[PDB]
Design a protein around this ligand. Sequence first.
Ligand SMILES: [Ca+2]
Lengths: 223, 58
Amino acid sequence: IVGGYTCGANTVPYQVSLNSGYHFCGGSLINSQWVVSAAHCYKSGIQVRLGEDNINVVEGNEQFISASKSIVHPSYNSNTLNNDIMLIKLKSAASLNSRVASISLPTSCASAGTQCLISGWGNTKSSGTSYPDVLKCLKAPILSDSSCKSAYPGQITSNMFCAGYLEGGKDSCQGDSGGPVVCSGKLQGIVSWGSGCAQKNKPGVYTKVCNYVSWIKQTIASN
Amino acid sequence: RPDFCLEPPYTGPCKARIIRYFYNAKAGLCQTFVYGGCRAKRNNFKSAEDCMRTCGGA
Ligand SMILES: [Ca+2]
């Protein structure tokens, strides 16, 4: 996250780290065994880490659980990044406490001008490289479909949205993929793609979670 | 050996932090770089060994 602030420990209780020897992606805890993330974060040998703040040291609040299944959305297009969504079933159920809690799926879609929280352990420099120890947070509003399609002509589908600041400086970046965009307690988005990070007139692009709810509920229930 | 082995590493538009390998023709070895997780170009290998086998000699 470029331009954000330090969330403060365990204050985004539904944020997860996806680990493959190192932090490669984010995710959101949707119930005790299910995590939602980005399709492009698909790896084998995932470990999920719950209750993280400093991803580099062991703080005593963590639950490291391996994934039993990883289900990438049947219509994920790796060229167009349409349907950039995936579900991860943990080998065993997490223990839900105060440091580890899940996020509600939305009932409706958010509108333009909704202010959201985007969190992650990804790059904090727009140009350059600086990966933080602790979790980083950003309030960024949902952009209008029209401005999103102007920022990226011919590339936004009905399953995308744009959030952030057309002036730049505040965005999600490499490392942030799969992590939450949470608006009024509900999971609206998944950190997906952009043109670089925190560039002027190129906001971040996110998966429109509200289109998927049905698919998610039924996929969780039959796996 | 080849000419895609001379291209610079491509992170791409996605925002994962995935560590992969590319052939650095300047150095004459395979190096690591961050791959955003989508839209890879051909100078992008999952291990150093793969990279040396395909490019090493470029
Ligand atoms: Ca930790």
